[PDB]
């Protein structure tokens, strides 16, 4: 199984700034990385797939990236409603393995 490791677990950024969430796999997963966002007390929304392609209607603030075993999700002009638990799933081989999440707190 491929193993997605998310560190750090908590992130604080101020309203209007940048944050970036780092995800990493245990072998070259050849860019097959998806990012979900889980809003508190809601279901996940798929933001990005294939490391950087946005799903239908996640506004361009969210910028997926990466390569090999190291990927990252950047968010800009951080909104007080950006608070959520962010997870990377991988989508190269079965079974589709997630990360631990990162809570983005608003300073």
């Amino acid at each position: 199984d491929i193993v997605m490791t998310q560190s750090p677990k908590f992130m604080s950024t101020s309203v209007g700034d940048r944050v970036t969430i780092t995800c990493k796999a245990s072998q070259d997963v050849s860019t097959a990385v998806v990012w979900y966002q889980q809003k508190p007390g809601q279901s996940p929304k798929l933001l990005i797939y294939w490391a950087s392609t946005r799903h239908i209607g996640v506004p361009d603030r969210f910028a997926g990236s990466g390569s090999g075993t190291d990927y990252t999700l950047t968010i800009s002009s951080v909104q007080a409603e950006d608070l959520a638990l962010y997870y990377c799933q991988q989508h190269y081989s079965p079974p589709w393995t997630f990360g631990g999440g990162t809570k983005l707190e608003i300073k």
Partner: protein, 389 residues
């Protein structure tokens, strides 16, 4: 025929699609000496149509099957065998040696082209009438590759699309013009197309159209039209919002004809389209992210319109089944008023998505068009990855 062929006719009305061939290779392959292959295609002689594919030089059960994810190796061989049989050890015909290829009959004999090599010292040898006639070497030294479909010939001239260079950058594409295996001319890519890979070509009315893959930025395909009479070409993207590469962003409402449609970069999967005004049909995988499902959608004036949405469709492979590469082929020697339009879909099985086995492989489905509006079925490879364990 005893004479070269001229593409005198035009396409017939595509109104639905009918099954033309299905080899069932992995299903049979669990117990016969079916060869591991990938990148298939189909091509017609004036006398018969055969399935062609890039062999990996091992049977699917054989222990050397493990690790066939690798595209290029020196155990790759371009083979052919009868229409709708499996690539069997005891009936494939090896056409030339290499890991990239195109093949097509000019009316008299056929040309096969197999590229072989180290990734920085690759070399093509242009076989004509089963004899090695010409050889071209790498101009940009980073993987010299060609079509993985059949080329079309006209009056002896068969244009062929070769790309050497980066699949991640600008590459160095070039159209070559063969007549009887010799190089008549070769010219560099021109047009608004940013990067060309794995071109799918059909010929009608003395013009050949190729629908390719932009690996770099495209999610909308580059179309190259080539004029085999004057040995000239141009390229553009397909204007339609209906995006056909895979992966892709979800289709816009307005598409893009003179630049890549921005979204999924450094990736694609070979494909085709029949581009003919009202009678345009585009093929695409259903998944925006994976080679699963295949469908044919009629999108009138797709090539030229930045607003063309579909008006009729047909399902070929369900989204719950796997697909892969697709390309165009036609029987130029089929007696008619017109050219029957056909395509094939490769059905990948194995690694990476079914990694419980260590081999990758495929079977083939192919359709041709009918003017009747026939009913549709959906055509699964069919094997159970669990009986190979």
């Amino acid at each position: 025929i005893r004479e070269f062929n001229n593409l005198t006719k035009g396409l017939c009305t595509i109104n639905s699609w009918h099954i033309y061939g299905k080899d069932n290779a992995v299903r049979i392959g669990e117990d016969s000496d079916v060869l591991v292959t990938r990148e298939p295609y189909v091509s017609c002689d004036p006398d018969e149509c055969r399935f062609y594919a890039l062999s990996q030089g091992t049977t699917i059960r054989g222990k050397h099957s493990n690790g066939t994810i690798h595209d290029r190796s020196q155990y790759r061989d371009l083979i052919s065998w009868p229409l709708s049989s499996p690539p069997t050890v005891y009936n494939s015909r090896v056409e030339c040696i290499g890991w990239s290829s195109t093949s097509c009959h000019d009316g008299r004999a056929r040309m096969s082209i197999c590229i072989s090599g180290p990734n920085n010292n690759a070399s093509a040898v242009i076989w004509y009438n089963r004899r090695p006639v010409t050889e071209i070497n790498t101009w940009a030294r980073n993987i010299l590759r060609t079509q993985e479909s059949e080329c079309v010939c006209q009056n002896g001239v068969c244009p062929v699309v070769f790309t050497d260079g980066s699949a991640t950058g600008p590459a160095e594409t070039r159209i070559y013009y063969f007549k009887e295996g010799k190089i008549l001319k070769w010219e560099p890519l021109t047009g608004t197309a940013k990067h060309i890979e794995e071109c799918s070509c059909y010929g009608e009315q003395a013009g050949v159209t190729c629908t390719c893959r932009d690996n770099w930025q495209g999610s909308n395909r580059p179309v190259i039209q080539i004029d085999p009479v004057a040995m000239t070409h141009t390229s553009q993207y397909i204007c339609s919002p209906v995006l056909t590469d895979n992966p892709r962003p979800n289709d816009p409402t307005v598409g893009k004809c003179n630049d890549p449609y921005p979204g999924n970069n450094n990736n694609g999967v070979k494909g085709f389209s029949y581009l003919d005004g009202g009678n345009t049909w585009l093929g695409r995988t259903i998944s925006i992210a994976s080679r699963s499902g295949y469908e044919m959608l009629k999108v009138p004036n797709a090539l030229t319109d930045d607003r063309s949405k579909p008006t009729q469709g047909q399902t070929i492979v369900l989204n719950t089944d796997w697909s892969g590469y697709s390309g165009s082929f036609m029987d130029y020697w089929a007696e008619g008023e017109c050219y029957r339009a056909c395509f094939y879909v490769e059905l990948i099985r194995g690694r990476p998505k079914e990694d419980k086995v260590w081999w990758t492989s495929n079977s083939i489905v192919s359709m041709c068009s009918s003017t009747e509006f026939l009913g549709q079925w959906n055509w699964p490879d069919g094997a159970k990855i669990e009986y190979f364990l």
